[PDB]
Amino acid sequence: NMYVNKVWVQCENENCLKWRLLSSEDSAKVDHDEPWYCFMNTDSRYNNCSISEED
Amino acid sequence: NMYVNKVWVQCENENCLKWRLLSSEDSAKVDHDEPWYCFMNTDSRYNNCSISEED
Numbered sequence: 001n002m003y004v005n006k007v008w009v010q011c012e013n014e015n016c017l018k019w020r021l022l023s024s025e026d027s028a029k030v031d032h033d034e035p036w037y038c039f040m041n042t043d044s045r046y047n048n049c050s051i052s053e054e055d
Numbered sequence: 056n057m058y059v060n061k062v063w064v065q066c067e068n069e070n071c072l073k074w075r076l077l078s079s080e081d082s083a084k085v086d087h088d089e090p091w092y093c094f095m096n097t098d099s100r101y102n103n104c105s106i107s108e109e110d
């Protein structure tokens with residue numbers, strides 16, 4: 001029995017490229033056929049390309 | 056671009072059933088066709104059914 005709780009997703013702004021931590025539910029709600037950017041993050045702590053990557 | 060860093064795996068000892076956090080590399084090294092138990096955890100902090108689940 002295994003479970004993925006969280007998934008990292010990369011911002012596709014060529015001047016950012018930061019990895020953001022999403023819940024697995026939120027990652028499931030991303031359209032893979034389109035680019036993903038920081039501003040699409042539901043986590044308001046990490047929803048902007050100017051904010052450093054989460055430790 | 057997405058990446059799973061960690062995966063939770065459940066102990067199959069009927070008197071334990073605890074979830075343990077594995078790296079995605081370690082989870083990839085588990086044989087799904089066999090039961091998994093706490094003692095199979097490479098993480099010595101959480102490799103025994105008597106140890107509480109990680110926060």
Ligand code: NA
Pocket residue numbers: 014015
């Ligand atoms: Na540039």
Ligand code: NA
Pocket residue numbers: 069070
């Ligand atoms: Na019992």
Ligand SMILES: [Zn+2]
Pocket residue numbers: 011012013016017018037038039048049050
């Ligand atoms: Zn960004």
Ligand SMILES: [Zn+2]
Pocket residue numbers: 066067068071072073092093094103104105
């Ligand atoms: Zn156990």
